[PDB]
Scaffold this active site. Sequence first.
Site, PDB file in Angstrom:
ATOM      1  N   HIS A 125     -45.576 -53.288  28.690  1.00  0.00           N
ATOM      2  CA  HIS A 125     -46.051 -52.600  29.886  1.00  0.00           C
ATOM      3  C   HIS A 125     -44.957 -51.861  30.647  1.00  0.00           C
ATOM      4  O   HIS A 125     -45.285 -51.109  31.560  1.00  0.00           O
ATOM      5  CB  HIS A 125     -46.734 -53.613  30.831  1.00  0.00           C
ATOM      6  CG  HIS A 125     -47.584 -52.983  31.891  1.00  0.00           C
ATOM      7  ND1 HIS A 125     -47.151 -52.807  33.185  1.00  0.00           N
ATOM      8  CD2 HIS A 125     -48.837 -52.464  31.835  1.00  0.00           C
ATOM      9  CE1 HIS A 125     -48.112 -52.233  33.891  1.00  0.00           C
ATOM     10  NE2 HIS A 125     -49.139 -52.003  33.091  1.00  0.00           N
ATOM     11  N   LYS A 127     -42.291 -49.318  32.108  1.00  0.00           N
ATOM     12  CA  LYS A 127     -42.015 -47.874  32.168  1.00  0.00           C
ATOM     13  C   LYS A 127     -40.589 -47.682  32.714  1.00  0.00           C
ATOM     14  O   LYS A 127     -40.328 -47.969  33.885  1.00  0.00           O
ATOM     15  CB  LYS A 127     -43.007 -47.132  33.070  1.00  0.00           C
ATOM     16  CG  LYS A 127     -44.500 -47.394  32.818  1.00  0.00           C
ATOM     17  CD  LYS A 127     -44.916 -48.793  33.465  1.00  0.00           C
ATOM     18  CE  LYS A 127     -46.426 -48.874  33.838  1.00  0.00           C
ATOM     19  NZ  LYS A 127     -47.226 -49.236  32.639  1.00  0.00           N
ATOM     20  N   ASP A 132     -28.307 -40.726  29.253  1.00  0.00           N
ATOM     21  CA  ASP A 132     -26.866 -40.542  29.080  1.00  0.00           C
ATOM     22  C   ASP A 132     -26.075 -41.760  29.541  1.00  0.00           C
ATOM     23  O   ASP A 132     -24.893 -41.645  29.909  1.00  0.00           O
ATOM     24  CB  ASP A 132     -26.376 -39.283  29.798  1.00  0.00           C
ATOM     25  CG  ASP A 132     -26.807 -38.013  29.089  1.00  0.00           C
ATOM     26  OD1 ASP A 132     -27.165 -38.114  27.891  1.00  0.00           O
ATOM     27  OD2 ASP A 132     -26.817 -36.930  29.740  1.00  0.00           O
ATOM     28  N   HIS A 337     -51.183 -46.329  41.706  1.00  0.00           N
ATOM     29  CA  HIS A 337     -50.527 -47.200  40.737  1.00  0.00           C
ATOM     30  C   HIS A 337     -49.273 -47.913  41.270  1.00  0.00           C
ATOM     31  O   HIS A 337     -48.613 -48.584  40.497  1.00  0.00           O
ATOM     32  CB  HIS A 337     -50.162 -46.399  39.489  1.00  0.00           C
ATOM     33  CG  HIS A 337     -51.296 -46.222  38.533  1.00  0.00           C
ATOM     34  ND1 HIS A 337     -51.224 -46.611  37.211  1.00  0.00           N
ATOM     35  CD2 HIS A 337     -52.532 -45.688  38.702  1.00  0.00           C
ATOM     36  CE1 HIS A 337     -52.373 -46.336  36.614  1.00  0.00           C
ATOM     37  NE2 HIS A 337     -53.182 -45.776  37.494  1.00  0.00           N
TER      38      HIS A 337
END
Lengths: 408, 408
Positions: A125, A127, A132, A337
């Site tokens: 789940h 994110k 870099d 969300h």
Amino acid sequence: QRPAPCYDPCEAVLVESIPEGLEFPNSNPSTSQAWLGLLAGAHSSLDIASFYWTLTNNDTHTQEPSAQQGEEVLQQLQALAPRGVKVRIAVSKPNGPLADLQSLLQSGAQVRMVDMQKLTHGVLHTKFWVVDQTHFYLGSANMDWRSLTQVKELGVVMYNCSCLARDLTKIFEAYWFLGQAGSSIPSTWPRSFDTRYNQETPMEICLNGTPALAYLASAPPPLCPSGRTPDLKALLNVVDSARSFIYIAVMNYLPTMEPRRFWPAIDDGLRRAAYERGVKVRLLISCWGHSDPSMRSFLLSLAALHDNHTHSDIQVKLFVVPTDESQARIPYARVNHNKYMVTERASYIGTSNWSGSYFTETAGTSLLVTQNGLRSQLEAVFLRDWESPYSHDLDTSANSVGNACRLL
Amino acid sequence: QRPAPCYDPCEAVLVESIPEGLEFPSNPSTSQAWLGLLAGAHSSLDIASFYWTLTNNDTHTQEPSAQQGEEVLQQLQALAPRGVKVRIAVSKPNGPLADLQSLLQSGAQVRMVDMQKLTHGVLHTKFWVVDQTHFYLGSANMDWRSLTQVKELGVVMYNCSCLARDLTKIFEAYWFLGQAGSSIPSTWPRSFDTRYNQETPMEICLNGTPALAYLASAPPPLCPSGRTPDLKALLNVVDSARSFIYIAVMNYLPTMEPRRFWPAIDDGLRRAAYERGVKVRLLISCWGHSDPSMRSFLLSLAALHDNHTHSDIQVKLFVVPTDESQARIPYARVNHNKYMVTERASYIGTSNWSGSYFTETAGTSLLVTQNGGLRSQLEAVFLRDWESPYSHDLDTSANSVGNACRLL
Ligand SMILES: *[C@@H]1O[C@H](CO)[C@@H](O[C@@H]2O[C@H](CO)[C@@H](O[C@@H]3O[C@H](CO[C@H]4O[C@H](CO[C@H]5O[C@H](CO)[C@@H](O)[C@H](O)[C@@H]5O)[C@@H](O)[C@H](O[C@H]5O[C@H](CO)[C@@H](O)[C@H](O)[C@@H]5O)[C@@H]4O)[C@@H](O)[C@H](O[C@H]4O[C@H](CO)[C@@H](O)[C@H](O)[C@@H]4O)[C@@H]3O)[C@H](O)[C@H]2NC(C)=O)[C@H](O)[C@H]1NC(C)=O
Ligand SMILES: *[C@@H]1O[C@H](CO)[C@@H](O[C@@H]2O[C@H](CO)[C@@H](O)[C@H](O)[C@H]2NC(C)=O)[C@H](O)[C@H]1NC(C)=O
Ligand SMILES: *[C@@H]1O[C@H](CO)[C@@H](O[C@@H]2O[C@H](CO)[C@@H](O)[C@H](O)[C@H]2NC(C)=O)[C@H](O)[C@H]1NC(C)=O
Ligand SMILES: *[C@@H]1O[C@H](CO)[C@@H](O)[C@H](O)[C@H]1NC(C)=O
């Protein structure tokens, strides 16, 4: 003995997606512009931890101009490997093939699909982006064009903070290891996955020109190496250390294992904070037509604690994104969300909704920061949302809210 | 390896005090059972007690309804000159007790347990052990009001010497601590220990049929090695229930009445209802002295009743009516009962349901499982009280209840 301090000039920016039509008579940069800037600056590497991929109109069987930003994001992703950037994508194992990922593969990126369901009976789940080994994004926005323009999102981009970014890469590396075909979670992870930066000894960083303490927490427990703080422990340490207020905005909250189990760890932390310390608790839960209706009873149970004899003060509102006639044609959109917590002393920004599986089986990460800033900006977002006409008491009528809400 | 079974012809009788004026559409009264026990006593009598107000002189009243309590005191005074060794343990009072002076002068032994210095609690337990053969255990205090002006629930176990001798070890802990300077050993002498507990209960013949019985004890520092703690026993009944949980207690509060939140029982009930679909019915007493902070916590529980979760928790308040003459009696017209019954098990206790009663204050409970009987009779007491006009929902008006009630 504390671990080595960091001297990188870390700078943190809160990044939001505000759905089209939502207006807040009152700004943070949008998720879309922050991702395109990160991609435009990338010269060496990109690691993405992700849940699913729907960046295009074809992905959602739609013909929406609102998808342009997502489509642009995907184009800039396909351009990365052919200009020398090593891209590594970890995604939760999907049901059907993903076109976005097939395009990314043919452009030269690497993808592995993590079957969290076999390993732990959860999903991948998380994110986040690591760019870099210097910058990272962590927040609620999925690789989804709706996440840029049709649903509300909150995250943070940490720029110029190599010490912390390499620390995130250790978590991503756990995912990458479990993305190989025959991989099994080790009983003890190799020492390369371990960290010295945690709840007990956080990383000492310079944050916008001022000293601060920061660390990254991880879920589920089988993915946590020896010195990595578990996500639940970090969240509850913030709840338990609060002395004045606890503001929480999360899409779903449930003191359960969504064989059913009751799971009161967070719920009792809030009850304790309010009764023993008189901390003001404000709980902002999202609601749309897909909300689990069993949420209402538990929320009413918390709100009953608001009482002039114990002097406990717990309050609950629901945040509903209005939908107009055209917008209602977009699938799975017009919701909030966000998943974050702010107190008078601490900030918590996470990828997980607040129910038991995200803390025992499902992959997640959270960023914890203390400073004497980002905290006040997060509290400002919370108060703006809490005071907007989009937030409603538990007794509000369901037609007066602008969208479907099962909890009303 | 289980301990030795008992062959004593144990017989258990539920014993009640029904306040004058309360009518129902019947068990022996506390007064009759105590008088029978006293007349039959031939060798020893041990009383664990909270306070002594058996006469009108003690309460500065002139009530004819005090006669039963006075007869009790009279018959207690006849024990020592007949050769019965009487030992009375009382919570250390804040002033002299006339009852105890009269008993010392008749030849009884009296010791006062200063639990406040020992553990910061009180000696709250009410039980009688008679000739190492019979015992009373329940809510009635050594108080004439407990016979005629307050509602009480207890049990008398007759002809059950194994179990009575097991109770005497608990009394002996009180008797040892009733000496001056006694200090509560780190490990109690082996003579205080027991083999009958939650893991291996006493196997008894109860009303002619096999049953399992044991006695639980509080606070933990007074518990020797094989003695089950009261909280453990209560929580095991809650967690083993599969169909319903009926609880009638005078006070219920999920706190330490420096303030602490205390959810052990509360989370037991929430778990029972959500995970196993257990019907929980909570019957709380209310009078003019009720702690008003109870209402919010009770509302929080009643909020779990929902047709999505299918949890079914219900709360009523039991108020004993008072007429104009009765309101002149000090500290009366309440329901002091403290018990729990499920479809499987019986729990009869001396403690109200808040934290100090399980961590600091002395208490005892009796746990019985049997395959009907005592269990069905306790359930009948509960259902009579629950469906009576003396029980009211949390939204009932304060003026329609027959007495002052702080929670309405
Ligand atoms: C718990 O168990 C006890 C038993 O231990 C039981 O108590 C008994 O209850 C019955 C009633 O159901 C009583 O029965 C009455 O007894 C009257 C005569 O009592 C005298 O004789 C008794 C019998 O003695 C024999 O057995 C003993 C023991 O084996 C033995 O030592 C003797 O030598 C002899 O063999 C005797 O037990 C009793 O002793 C007690 O009392 C004296 C005086 O108080 C005391 O000094 C002792 O120390 C001892 O405590 C006494 O000597 C009898 O007249 C009477 O008959 C009338 O009544 C019945 C019904 O009412 C009518 O049918 C009949 O026509 C007559 O009108 C009746 O049989 C018995 O006395 C009790 N025993 C005791 C010790 O109290 C409890 O009920 C049980 N509890 C529960 C809740 O069930
Ligand atoms: C830390 O520094 C960064 C970089 O200057 C700040 O980010 C800016 O934030 C404002 C609004 O808060 C935006 O309008 C700017 O566009 C942001 N700049 C960039 C480059 O994104 C950030 O606000 C600073 N943090 C604090 C707490 O002041
Ligand atoms: C177990 O045996 C005792 C002994 O007889 C029973 O007690 C009697 O119960 C009835 C009904 O409650 C009363 O009217 C009697 O007065 C009781 N006797 C005494 C001596 O007090 C008891 O009811 C039995 N228990 C069960 C479950 O049958
Ligand atoms: C980070 O570093 C670059 C170059 O070192 C600098 O130009 C930039 O302003 C810094 N801040 C951000 C947000 O990139």
